[PDB]
Amino acid sequence: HDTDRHYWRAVTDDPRVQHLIPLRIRFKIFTWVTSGWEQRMQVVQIMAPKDSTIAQVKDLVIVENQSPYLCVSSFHLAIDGKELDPQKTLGEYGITEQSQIDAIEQNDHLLHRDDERPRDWTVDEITAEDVKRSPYKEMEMQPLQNLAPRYEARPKGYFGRTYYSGMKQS
Amino acid sequence: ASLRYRRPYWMMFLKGVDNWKIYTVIQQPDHQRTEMLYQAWLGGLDRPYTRPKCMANQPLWLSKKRHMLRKERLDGPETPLEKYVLEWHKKFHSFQGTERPTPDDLHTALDLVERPLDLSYALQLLGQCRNLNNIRFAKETFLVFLEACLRVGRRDCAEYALEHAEPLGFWFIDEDHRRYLQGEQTWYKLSPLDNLYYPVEENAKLNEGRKP
Amino acid sequence: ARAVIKRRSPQLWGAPGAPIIRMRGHHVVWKFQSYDLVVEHTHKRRNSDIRLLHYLGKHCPHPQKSLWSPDTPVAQDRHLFMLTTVDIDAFKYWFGVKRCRLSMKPWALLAKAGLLPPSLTQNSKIMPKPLFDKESLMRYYLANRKDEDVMAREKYLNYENSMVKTEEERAAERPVAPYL
Amino acid sequence: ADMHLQVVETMVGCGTMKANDYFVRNVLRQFSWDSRFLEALYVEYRRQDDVDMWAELTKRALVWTARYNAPASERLRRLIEDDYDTIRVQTRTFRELAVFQFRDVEERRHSRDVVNELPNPWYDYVAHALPFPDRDAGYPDEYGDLGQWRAPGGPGSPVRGPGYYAPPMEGEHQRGYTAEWRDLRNPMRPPEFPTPWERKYRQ
Amino acid sequence: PSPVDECLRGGSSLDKRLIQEVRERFVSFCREYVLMDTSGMKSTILSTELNAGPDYEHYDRRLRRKRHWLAIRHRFEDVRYVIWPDVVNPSLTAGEMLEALLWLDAASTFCVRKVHPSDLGDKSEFLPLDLQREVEVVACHARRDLDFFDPSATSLEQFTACAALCVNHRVPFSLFFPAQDVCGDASVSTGQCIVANAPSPHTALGAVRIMALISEGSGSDIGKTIMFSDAFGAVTRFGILRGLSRVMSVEAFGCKDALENVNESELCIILHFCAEVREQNAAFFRRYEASEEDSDPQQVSFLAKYQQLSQIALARCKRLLYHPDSPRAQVMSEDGYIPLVELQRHAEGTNKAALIHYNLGIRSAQGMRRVALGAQSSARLAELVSRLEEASARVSGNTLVNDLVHHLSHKAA
Amino acid sequence: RADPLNGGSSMTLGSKGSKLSPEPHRRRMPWTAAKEYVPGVVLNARDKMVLDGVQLLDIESIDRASQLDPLEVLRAVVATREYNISTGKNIFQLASQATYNGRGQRFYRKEWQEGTYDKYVTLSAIDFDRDGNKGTAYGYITFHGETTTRPVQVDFADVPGWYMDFVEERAVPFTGIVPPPPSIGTDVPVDPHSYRLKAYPYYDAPNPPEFVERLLKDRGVLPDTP
Amino acid sequence: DIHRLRPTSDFKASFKDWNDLFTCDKRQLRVRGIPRMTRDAIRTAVQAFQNGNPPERFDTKEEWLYYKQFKTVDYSYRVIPELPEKYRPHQSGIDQAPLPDYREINKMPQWAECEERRQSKKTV
Amino acid sequence: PTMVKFYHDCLVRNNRPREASSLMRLAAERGVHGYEDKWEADVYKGRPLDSEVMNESEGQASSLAFASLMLRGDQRPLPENLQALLEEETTRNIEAERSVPVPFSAGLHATEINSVFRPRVYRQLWYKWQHIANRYRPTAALKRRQLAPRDSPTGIPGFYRI
Amino acid sequence: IPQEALHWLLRMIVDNFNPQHVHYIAAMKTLQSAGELDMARDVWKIMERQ
Amino acid sequence: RQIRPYYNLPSKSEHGRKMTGFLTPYRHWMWKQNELWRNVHEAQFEHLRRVYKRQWLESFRVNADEYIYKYNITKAAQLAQWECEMKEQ
Amino acid sequence: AASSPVPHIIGSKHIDVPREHRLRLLPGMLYLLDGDTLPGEFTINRVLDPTALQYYGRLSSQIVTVEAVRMLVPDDLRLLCNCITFKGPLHLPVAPYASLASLRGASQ
RNA sequence: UUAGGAAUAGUUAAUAAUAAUUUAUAAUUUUGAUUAGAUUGUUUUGUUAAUGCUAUUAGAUGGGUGUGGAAAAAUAAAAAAAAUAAUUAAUAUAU
Numbered sequence A: 001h002d003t004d005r006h007y008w009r010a011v012t013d014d015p016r017v018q019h020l021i022p023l024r025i026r027f028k029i030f031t032w033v034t035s036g037w038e039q040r041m042q043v044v045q046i047m048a049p050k051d052s053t054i055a056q057v058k059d060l061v062i063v064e065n066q067s068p069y070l071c072v073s074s075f076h077l078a079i080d081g082k083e084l085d086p087q088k089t090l091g092e093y094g095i096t097e098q099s100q101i102d103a104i105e106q107n108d109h110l111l112h113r114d115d116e117r118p119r120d121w122t123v124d125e126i127t128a129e130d131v132k133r134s135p136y137k138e139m140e141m142q143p144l145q146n147l148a149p150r151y152e153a154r155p156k157g158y159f160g161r162t163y164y165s166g167m168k169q170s
Numbered sequence B: 001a002s003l004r005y006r007r008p009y010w011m012m013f014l015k016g017v018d019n020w021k022i023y024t025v026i027q028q029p030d031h032q033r034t035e036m037l038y039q040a041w042l043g044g045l046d047r048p049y050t051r052p053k054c055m056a057n058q059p060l061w062l063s064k065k066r067h068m069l070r071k072e073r074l075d076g077p078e079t080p081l082e083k084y085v086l087e088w089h090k091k092f093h094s095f096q097g098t099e100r101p102t103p104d105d106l107h108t109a110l111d112l113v114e115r116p117l118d119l120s121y122a123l124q125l126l127g128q129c130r131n132l133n134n135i136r137f138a139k140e141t142f143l144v145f146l147e148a149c150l151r152v153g154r155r156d157c158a159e160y161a162l163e164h165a166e167p168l169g170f171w172f173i174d175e176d177h178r179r180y181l182q183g184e185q186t187w188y189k190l191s192p193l194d195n196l197y198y199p200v201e202e203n204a205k206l207n208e209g210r211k212p
Numbered sequence C: 001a002r003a004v005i006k007r008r009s010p011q012l013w014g015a016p017g018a019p020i021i022r023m024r025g026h027h028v029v030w031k032f033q034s035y036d037l038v039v040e041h042t043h044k045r046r047n048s049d050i051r052l053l054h055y056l057g058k059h060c061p062h063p064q065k066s067l068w069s070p071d072t073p074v075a076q077d078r079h080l081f082m083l084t085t086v087d088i089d090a091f092k093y094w095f096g097v098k099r100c101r102l103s104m105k106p107w108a109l110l111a112k113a114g115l116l117p118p119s120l121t122q123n124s125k126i127m128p129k130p131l132f133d134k135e136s137l138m139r140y141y142l143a144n145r146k147d148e149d150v151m152a153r154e155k156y157l158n159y160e161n162s163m164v165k166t167e168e169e170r171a172a173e174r175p176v177a178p179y180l
Numbered sequence D: 001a002d003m004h005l006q007v008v009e010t011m012v013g014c015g016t017m018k019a020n021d022y023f024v025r026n027v028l029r030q031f032s033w034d035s036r037f038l039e040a041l042y043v044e045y046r047r048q049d050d051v052d053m054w055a056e057l058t059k060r061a062l063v064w065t066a067r068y069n070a071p072a073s074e075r076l077r078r079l080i081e082d083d084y085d086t087i088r089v090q091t092r093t094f095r096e097l098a099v100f101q102f103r104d105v106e107e108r109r110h111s112r113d114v115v116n117e118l119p120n121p122w123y124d125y126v127a128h129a130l131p132f133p134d135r136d137a138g139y140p141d142e143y144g145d146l147g148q149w150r151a152p153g154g155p156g157s158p159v160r161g162p163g164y165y166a167p168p169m170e171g172e173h174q175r176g177y178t179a180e181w182r183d184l185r186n187p188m189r190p191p192e193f194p195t196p197w198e199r200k201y202r203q
Numbered sequence E: 001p002s003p004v005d006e007c008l009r010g011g012s013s014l015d016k017r018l019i020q021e022v023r024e025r026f027v028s029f030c031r032e033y034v035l036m037d038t039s040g041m042k043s044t045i046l047s048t049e050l051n052a053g054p055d056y057e058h059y060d061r062r063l064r065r066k067r068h069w070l071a072i073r074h075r076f077e078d079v080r081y082v083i084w085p086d087v088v089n090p091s092l093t094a095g096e097m098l099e100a101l102l103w104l105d106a107a108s109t110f111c112v113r114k115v116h117p118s119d120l121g122d123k124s125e126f127l128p129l130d131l132q133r134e135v136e137v138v139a140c141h142a143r144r145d146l147d148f149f150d151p152s153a154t155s156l157e158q159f160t161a162c163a164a165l166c167v168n169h170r171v172p173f174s175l176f177f178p179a180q181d182v183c184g185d186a187s188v189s190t191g192q193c194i195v196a197n198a199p200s201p202h203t204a205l206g207a208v209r210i211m212a213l214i215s216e217g218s219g220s221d222i223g224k225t226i227m228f229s230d231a232f233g234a235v236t237r238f239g240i241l242r243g244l245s246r247v248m249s250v251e252a253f254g255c256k257d258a259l260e261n262v263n264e265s266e267l268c269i270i271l272h273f274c275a276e277v278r279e280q281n282a283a284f285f286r287r288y289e290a291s292e293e294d295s296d297p298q299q300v301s302f303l304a305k306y307q308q309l310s311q312i313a314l315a316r317c318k319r320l321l322y323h324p325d326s327p328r329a330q331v332m333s334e335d336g337y338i339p340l341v342e343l344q345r346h347a348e349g350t351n352k353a354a355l356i357h358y359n360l361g362i363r364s365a366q367g368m369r370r371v372a373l374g375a376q377s378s379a380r381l382a383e384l385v386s387r388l389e390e391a392s393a394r395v396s397g398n399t400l401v402n403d404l405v406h407h408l409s410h411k412a413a
Numbered sequence F: 001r002a003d004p005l006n007g008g009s010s011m012t013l014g015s016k017g018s019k020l021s022p023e024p025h026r027r028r029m030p031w032t033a034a035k036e037y038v039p040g041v042v043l044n045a046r047d048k049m050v051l052d053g054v055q056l057l058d059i060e061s062i063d064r065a066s067q068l069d070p071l072e073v074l075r076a077v078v079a080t081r082e083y084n085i086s087t088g089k090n091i092f093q094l095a096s097q098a099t100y101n102g103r104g105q106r107f108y109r110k111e112w113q114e115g116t117y118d119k120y121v122t123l124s125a126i127d128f129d130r131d132g133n134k135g136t137a138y139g140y141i142t143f144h145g146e147t148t149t150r151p152v153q154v155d156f157a158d159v160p161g162w163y164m165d166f167v168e169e170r171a172v173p174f175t176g177i178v179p180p181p182p183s184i185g186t187d188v189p190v191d192p193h194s195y196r197l198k199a200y201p202y203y204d205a206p207n208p209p210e211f212v213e214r215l216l217k218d219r220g221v222l223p224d225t226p
Numbered sequence G: 001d002i003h004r005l006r007p008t009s010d011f012k013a014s015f016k017d018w019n020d021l022f023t024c025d026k027r028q029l030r031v032r033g034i035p036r037m038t039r040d041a042i043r044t045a046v047q048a049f050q051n052g053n054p055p056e057r058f059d060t061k062e063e064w065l066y067y068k069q070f071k072t073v074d075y076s077y078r079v080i081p082e083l084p085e086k087y088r089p090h091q092s093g094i095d096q097a098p099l100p101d102y103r104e105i106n107k108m109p110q111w112a113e114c115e116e117r118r119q120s121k122k123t124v
Numbered sequence H: 001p002t003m004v005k006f007y008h009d010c011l012v013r014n015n016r017p018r019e020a021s022s023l024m025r026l027a028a029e030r031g032v033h034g035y036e037d038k039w040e041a042d043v044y045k046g047r048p049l050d051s052e053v054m055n056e057s058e059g060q061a062s063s064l065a066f067a068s069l070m071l072r073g074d075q076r077p078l079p080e081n082l083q084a085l086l087e088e089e090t091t092r093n094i095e096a097e098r099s100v101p102v103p104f105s106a107g108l109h110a111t112e113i114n115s116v117f118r119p120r121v122y123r124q125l126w127y128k129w130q131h132i133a134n135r136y137r138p139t140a141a142l143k144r145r146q147l148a149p150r151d152s153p154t155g156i157p158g159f160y161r162i
Numbered sequence I: 001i002p003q004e005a006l007h008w009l010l011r012m013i014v015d016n017f018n019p020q021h022v023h024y025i026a027a028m029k030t031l032q033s034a035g036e037l038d039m040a041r042d043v044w045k046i047m048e049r050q
Numbered sequence J: 001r002q003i004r005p006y007y008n009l010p011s012k013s014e015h016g017r018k019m020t021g022f023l024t025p026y027r028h029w030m031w032k033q034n035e036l037w038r039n040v041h042e043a044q045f046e047h048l049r050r051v052y053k054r055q056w057l058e059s060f061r062v063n064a065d066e067y068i069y070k071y072n073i074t075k076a077a078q079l080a081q082w083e084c085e086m087k088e089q
Numbered sequence K: 001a002a003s004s005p006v007p008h009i010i011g012s013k014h015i016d017v018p019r020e021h022r023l024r025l026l027p028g029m030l031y032l033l034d035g036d037t038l039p040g041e042f043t044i045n046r047v048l049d050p051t052a053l054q055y056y057g058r059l060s061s062q063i064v065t066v067e068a069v070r071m072l073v074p075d076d077l078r079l080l081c082n083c084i085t086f087k088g089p090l091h092l093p094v095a096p097y098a099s100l101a102s103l104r105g106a107s108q
Numbered sequence L: 001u002u003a004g005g006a007a008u009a010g011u012u013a014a015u016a017a018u019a020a021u022u023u024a025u026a027a028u029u030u031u032g033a034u035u036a037g038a039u040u041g042u043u044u045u046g047u048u049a050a051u052g053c054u055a056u057u058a059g060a061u062g063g064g065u066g067u068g069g070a071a072a073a074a075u076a077a078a079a080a081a082a083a084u085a086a087u088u089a090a091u092a093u094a095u
């Protein structure tokens, strides 16, 4: 239970504050119609930090797709057909929210990933083991079904017939 | 009414020992000498040995050795049937054995019957196949059993199987074997290679000629 | 869960078990015997300075003369009196919120007070036990069963809360024209 | 499951008599389906040709509630209740009916009773549930008396100082021991209330 | 008083069994010193013990270990020419002389360091021994007999120990091997002789020891030890390539959980070895790993082994970083004694679900720790992971060095 | 808990039941899981009054002087078989005398078909040990038409009291795999003329009149008199 | 009559008839000369029969007499065997394991000799 | 009798039952007090000494390798290739059982557990010649409050201190 | 019952603790998820009276 | 205590108890009848349990908000008096 | 695979990882091939035990018939392969967009 | 707490150290230690004008079994112990 916090702080300080961009990245998918296959678009939205590189954006797309049919092979990020250098920052390309980013796949390969980083990893190192969701998707406050409501069963000083003092100093 | 808190935890579900109060006080030096002198009394060990602290019975390696080292009760087999009984006990009566016998192996024990003492060794192997090993007999098992009882001239054991066959395990008995032992027929088989009715005391009456 | 079990007081599910409302006695003669309705554990704590959870009251099993008969004569006033004191709120807290156990003698004593129905062991020996058959029970259930929403609102009033505000009170709780 | 539920309700409402096969093939073994699937499917079971097919399909739906850990809702049991004269499928347990009859007859004779309609303060409410009483009963005393050497009592005692004479105190203890602590032995004035509950109880 | 005092009291030293008994008693003395239970023993300067020794009640806590080390020194000065005679058929084999030298070095590394004013002897005796002659005598007796080093695991530990004795005591390791494989060379180093004659390790820990001895045996010679390529990418020396390929063997680093028993300090050795191999042969790696196909069957095996070792090392770094003190981040000892299994085997289970000594056996195994990254580990791994990449890569966008830096700042705050 | 009797109800300790949960109440004792058990005292103790006047022989005693007459040996084998059969029929004693070791046939306990109880086991595999009256049996459990997806171990397969009816159409050879019998709701369509449910959830059997008469005579409602 | 320490059937002469048995309370049972456990058993059996429960319980005398012969302290239906001072044959004076006479047990029995004589008679 | 009590526990601890059974057989024949009732039979009557087997093994050859093996008389050896493979089975099985530690012993035999020894002088006794190594008497020999009443000193300063 | 979500806030003030904003947020969201809107307004009035 | 009637299944065993717990179907049926007659009482018991629980919670609610109102008035007056004394000091 | 297109469940050959990366990448991976072609550097052990073959009863009856179950153990004894050979056609209806529609043994 | 008052130690802190091969000018004590003696404590008792003197009987228990959630386990008039055994009353025990 050592979560590196032994007091009560109701506010959030600067090391947990991140500056994020809602980057949405398109994928070329194929759906079956009565005629045959039709090419459509599947969009995966991530919150990437502003000073991140494009390889980090690709890793964020890999860890936040939650679909077994999208990240099936090694893909590459591109804008208007021109491929992107994965060792460059998003600010070097002027990538904004309205910039259309596509993911071109090579289905002959097989993407072998090893998810050792948890999905909700912040600086304070508090991770859930059964999280199964991006932290931007989950709600802030929800009902706790794992705990159990417990009332006070041990009286301190008052036990019976007449409340004279109640042994309040104890 | 459980012995969970009266004896140690390794004696959980423990039944069938001689006395489980022995193995709670083994570590005392007057009883620890008694345990090591008992292993020398049982033999099979070249060094002084004590059984483990959390074991009441003998270990599986030690009880296998004393079962293998144990001399057989039948020493000096005269007949090749009695040599097959000693091979039966090394194969189908080993310590913690897994393999079951075969109805063809019962036919091998029934084909070596020479003297009337061999039939008592053979029919007791037939009882282990039905009761102990629970083996369904073959279709020709009563055929080998019938001719085994006729070499030693023992007909009263052959007709004893007809009045109750399914307690003995003979699920197929052909009608000519039933007519022979009950007295309806006077022969039980027709030889394909000699063309005569067995036994040979009936062949002198029925078939006066020799045919291929 | 001991090697040699305490032969005189066996219990269930180890110590300290569920809290139980008992009527404990004193080590005196019967002529001065009184009972304490207490809340304790299933196994009695003899290694503590806190030997009980809560003290619900005292029952006197000896009948007293009615010393208040010329105050206001009502029906059956000049009979004898059985004096008992009962902590109502602590009993309801340990009964509903904490879900204590009950012995049959405190159950009968609290059924005399109107807090509980009469116990299971208080047998009318002239009336035998009922005999159930599912066909007559189904016929009575299909003869008159309540509505679903009416039964749900009855359970909501009995179990969840009983002070639900009317529309005339919601019209009074809302603010007025300087803020509305 | 809510996507398959609309398909099952559409196949029931169109009267195609094939919603049960879709529920078996797609929703039964591989989904955590709730009880309104069978509330939809009971109307499709009702439209069968013979009554025995209706009966066996309803009983098989009850066995499906038993096996796949999906308990039957109140609406489904009330739907099977209304056709008990035709199907004779029992939809309540042996325990709930014996509770229901003994509760309903007692509540009817209790509502018809004119004597026991009076309120009972022992039964109707809880008078007080706070750990401390709402008004001062005078106690504690917070002073010693004759024959008492231990003052303050320490653990589990409300006495704070000796009754008559004390070693010299400073600060808030000096103001407390002489003026501001409790004193129930004062015959003229009770121990005081906080502000502003002393002005309106001056007389 | 040691038992070796009764063997040097005027006996016939030319006898073989007397030399064997001297060696066995000195081995027993050094092993009793090394395996001494030092739980209650304490060494603090007490003023009342100035003009005397320690107290009679405080003999076993204060005087015993210091007297044991001084007896070890005073018997080493009398014994070291009997077990290890000067170089001119022998009385002792090379293996038992190696065992005696190993226990002597283990007693010398853990000598008593604190010098009290009570001690009448010199403080220089509270320093470790110089065993430069004995390693040369053991190497001369080990190159005399063939097949001293075998592909067995015990011979792998003996190879690690002999290379350790040659690194610590300034002895060339090529003396442990015959001169015909050192013929044709003007000078060879210790680490080159390690990387040229290393056997294939069956565990990851033996490979970690070999990769540590390679780095420590060549401090400034770490460039010449592991350079097997030119400045254009062509392989210069295939002997170093065959040594470095069989260091990172498939029996050691082949499994997905091959680094399950690697601590935070051994992972630094693994990443330092990978970074040194990448830095010394950068023209080979940046040519061959990107878009180059090679026909040499050894180079593809070396490249696959290096990629596998670097990937499992980065996976172990992410294991120790992102899951601190986790049950999947716990380590254990190789061939470690887990006594619950041996207690279940040598008991009679009438019901196999009832496991005896369960509350103690499930807690206890041979050394098993919850592993998290400290300050000295994280500050070194943040350098080594950045060393694993190329110079043209941006260290800002690396998502593992930044996580290590933020972990350092969060655990320091 | 997972499954309490009558929910939480603690006016008496008998209202909770004789067992508080179908799961084991402690983790260290998995054998305390709630399951259907079998009266092994009456069943495992066979009648020794059929072995009287019959000379049995030990296994190790193969010396010549301890051998018996072959007619006495045959009546000893008949008496030992009658001793093994005297209480009931085992699974391993019924499957040995069947084709393909009885694979695919339906085995059932005596009380598995009376009342409103309907349950059998379609046999899938049996591993006989050297003592052929014991072993380990496997099968698909069928309870009121519904069937398991995988073969489960048949509990109390060594205790006698089992029955089967041999059907040649259900026999599966050793080359093939015994298929699971179909669930009557899921796999095959539901037909009331083929299989009709004896019991269902929220159903209880009607009261027999002899049990009603016996309870009203025991309670004293009906005038029981000698 | 179920318990050993409640000899209920020993007081048949202490009652006149059925009504005398079912009208006597515990004070009248104390007057008639019945011990405390026996009169408690009689009164509880009468009160159970009045409530609709006839005295149909298993007599636990012989089961408790079986469990009495062991050295359990709390009479908790366990089996605790007694351990004597000598539990091994070697400390009872027996020097070694008994050797069976392999020449005497491998002789042919008398029925086998009679059958061999019958075979020699019928073969010739 | 104190020497026989110590020497029996040392031979039991060091896994020597032949030397311990011969010690009980010797003390019963010599008339040592406390051991006239304990007399053990010699189960090693036909077996030779343990040192004589190791001398014979260094230098009938089928019986030379199996001279250490103890038989009941109703047991027979295996063939020499089969018995030698069985003797290595028991060799690796005995050391496998003796290498497992008992979890609550602190690495001690049961003889070592609760075996604290001080001479007879530590508990209200002085020199006697026949008590060579006399264990100090237990604390139940002298109870307090039977030698002196309550709130009164007793002349036993170091009695109950072990 | 959902009324306990109103109870454990009240016992927070009887036991002389200052309820933080997260406690009011949790109480109002737990009472809104159970459909108790008047109890959520009671939590808001409790926050205003503090 | 579980009743062992005489007409249960007897265990003919000299190594344990002489009567098992295996019933008769009539015993099963009458035990079910007694179970239902206890189930009525335990239904009323649990009903009164939940009724008393919600009664205690409602009473705690009302008394708690009254105490909160009075204590807020008291602490406001106390803080004002403390601020005046601090100004004088 | 008979109702939806699974991406990498059906290949044209065995996946060719190097011999050093064989133990690291292969466990946890599944793919279907056409015909009974076994990978090299394995020892073929056919499962003939009826106690071990009984658990494919629902697989062989309601889906494609199980012909042979083989366990492949390599030279280093560290990477198993459970090879099950089915015989078509499927008893389940196969979608045209499914993965098993691209298999000749499943479509015929 | 001792009518005749002096030394004590499996020892103190640090620690990448579970399971301490290291470091230190270490720790307790004349403001009364350790040991030895007496020794359950406790505004519950008694007395008196008495903040004085004088009494006490709730309890716990590192080698008996690593079982059990917890050793408290070799014996206790109830603490009723998994089907309403009995719940009218008094003796409730001798019996």
Ligand SMILES: [Mg+2]
Binding pocket: L022, L023
């Ligand atoms: Mg240090």
